[model samples]
Target: TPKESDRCGGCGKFTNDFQWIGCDSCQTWYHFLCSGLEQFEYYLYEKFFCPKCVPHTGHSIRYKVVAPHRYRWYSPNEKHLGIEVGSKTWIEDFITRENTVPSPTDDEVCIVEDGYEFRREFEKLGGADNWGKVFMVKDMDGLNMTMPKPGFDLEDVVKIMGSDYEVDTIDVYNQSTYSMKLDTFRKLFRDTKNRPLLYNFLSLEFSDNNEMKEIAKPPRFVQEISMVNRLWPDVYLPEDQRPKVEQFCLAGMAGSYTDFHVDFGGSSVYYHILKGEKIFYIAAPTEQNFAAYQAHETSPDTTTWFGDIANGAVKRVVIKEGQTLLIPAGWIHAVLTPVDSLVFGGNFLHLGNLEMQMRVYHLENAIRKEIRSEEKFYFPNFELLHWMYMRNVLLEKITEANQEGSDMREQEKNIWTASQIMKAEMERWMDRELRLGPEKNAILPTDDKNKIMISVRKQIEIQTKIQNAKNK
Candidate 1:
């Protein structure tokens, strides 16, 4: 039976027709518009009290300090000004109040002409070892992709994704996260009357949706090297189980701020700004930086900005409309939207950064343990993908070379480099999996693991024997 407390106290409605807020005192729900609290003040409250319980409960307590995980905090005096969320006025006020303005660094963003040039230079620079710096391609013509051109707005997104499609959003003010309907977000996005209450994190993996599958195909260069595009299809996993990190659509409003973090699984990135612009603060994946980042991430009192903590290693790079930014594995970074922006990007694993990818995985595990959050922040089926790569790609290639002899030197060079990295790493992974028990290792059974390990070892020996004979 539904109780009176279940319906909106103000409107006497049972459905969620509008935004809802609940009193901490009585636990009764009220429509936000009818609750006497202005929309601008939504995130400012630490607790709420209904009119009936106000005398008993005292006034709502507000946050005392401006913290890193939290965002905006205009005072009661400034609240009446009605500064819109993500507006220039709000951005300036937030930055001034928080004292978080960072100075530009001398480090430069590496620039490339186009995708063809990127591939040529990437190979010449020794593949993954050359990804020490961030690379930008100014024009998208040669990338061989399609996207909604400039001037595509919130209304356009509502059409493709459907107005009722639900998305997760982060409050730019307090860094609190929640879900909202696409139509509700669009209304807030268009509202200049009330202070904006949301910033869509907008990283939705929509490859399964027919309407979204082809809107933005990854750049040709990425498709060529991406482990998911090349190897995932050959794996025994179901279509839904395959990682959907390859095609993500990011829609954000001005004043949106995503905190500093590494790409999940330490995968490399391909980011293209279809409209508007983004400011990126990036730090190289150095040993000292990784150690420092781990400490900063897990600390309870993480009020200090990551850029300040990294000394001069973190650099600012602004990418505008029609540009693509390629970030390599293990680089730590954060994003700020200077304007309403729509972007397309994806993450991929490859042979180039095997060691860094595994290192980052362990770091993610450690941090998850510290926070004890139920949410998953790491790549899906990370170990499962690696095992499939070994069995379906690496082992077969090496065995083919052994049967065909030295005729496959070009092929051998690529496989040999990846094999050397995965050899010891895969052994460690297998040992850990065995301890996880059969129920835990249901994704990759014991018999399957044994067979793949034997095959890998046999092929590696054959390659070693041939190379040794050549030295004589």
Candidate 2:
């Protein structure tokens, strides 16, 4: 007779039968049954590896850190925007295919233009040549002044503050334009705490608004700048109406680069080149590619590394002036830019409503996985109910909109009821498997259940095939 504890202690839910076993660094034991493992017996022979041990396993593959290419400044202007529309290939290639496209010809639209009034301003600022000059102040205490020493060198500061400082701190200053005398700028750089004050002044002056002055002001003229547009959606929206915007922004001066890694959100992206040339290395989205990206250990600290895509993935065309790069959701990509460049890109939920639908689909899949492993159907059924509810709500809304004479296309665009989609899928599965007439007590037979499962699987296979065909 096997004791429950002797079988497996994973999840604190013991089982009578022993299938697989493992121990983590925390000394927690895991049993295959309670762990919801799929390949129980096979995993048992694999040294009882734990989640903590997964990374150190010799089976883990690695990839080399490839250096990103640099591009000369191509002027980004209105005229160049339309030049590449007809003669050029779309950025959609990067996401549609798994390989990298060759860099476009010089005739393609470029973002960095040779001559512009801003070009003179950019050069006058010593564009990449100006290094080691005190650019901004961090704090301004009477006794101890803390300033950011210039060359705009962020390495030491970032190390001290952490990588998050790059996004949270740099983003604050980037949103505003600062104006200060050379000496004042140098002094302010010494006071890192008061750095926000300088940035706020510049931001306010740029907007030609004195709103900050009317509000609270610190002794050193430090003011908290509030960007209503940039604030989280929750702040401004009613609880019921808040729309989630998953997109985000990344900006940097020359010599700045992003490390290689896939976003966990796994959403497609659109990067608009606002003001610089960026070299991109992209990979396909696959477990192997993800492993390769991880093995490189190309953390954000590395300036040379961009993101990694899947293995043997094709490279897409490098984005230049007046171009928008459409990165398919889940594609691995890395970005490199020269000094004094700004890259503007974000994930969109609108286009085909694909991103939002994917979110719901992913949630459903996760629930399904959990249920399949545990044989606990409660959560999955609940999710199914919710999906159905959403479907009904969407249908009602569409009906209402149509009654109001709303454009059909606009109505279609507005409709993304998760429940509706799931219900349709389930109804299709039901209709294909059993002719459960439009009456009560139409219990599906056991054989019908099995047939439904096969039908659903076939549907999934067909959907994947269609997606692959579209990509080709």
**Alpha-carbon local distance difference test for all models:** 0.72, 0.34
Which lDDT tens digits does candidate 2 get at residues 341-405?
Answer: 43333332221323333443444345444333422111112222222233334345544554564
Candidate 1 overall lDDT versus native: 0.72
Model 1 ranges off by over 4 Å: 1-108, 113-124, 127-129, 233-236, 374-376, 407-410, 438-442
By summed lDDT, the worst window of 10 consecutive residues in model 2 runs over 200-209
TM-score result, candidate 2: 0.32
lDDT of 1 by residue, 1-472 (tens): 2344488778787752267778888888877775656444455567888778889898866555332223444344444444333334445564454324443342335677777676666676676544555778888766676665677766876888898776766666555566567777777777755643446555667677786776776777677777887765522556765777988888787777777889999998888998888888888788898889989888765346677678777777778988899888898987787778888898998777777888888888788878866454678777878888888888888888888775345545766778768878888777766877453435888778878988898888887787777774
Model 2 residue runs over 4 Å out of place are 1-249, 285-310, 314-316, 351-393, 397-472
TM-score for each model: 0.78, 0.32
- Evaluate candidate 1 by giving its C-alpha RMSD to the native, one decimal: 6.9
lDDT of 2: 0.34
Best by TM-score: 1
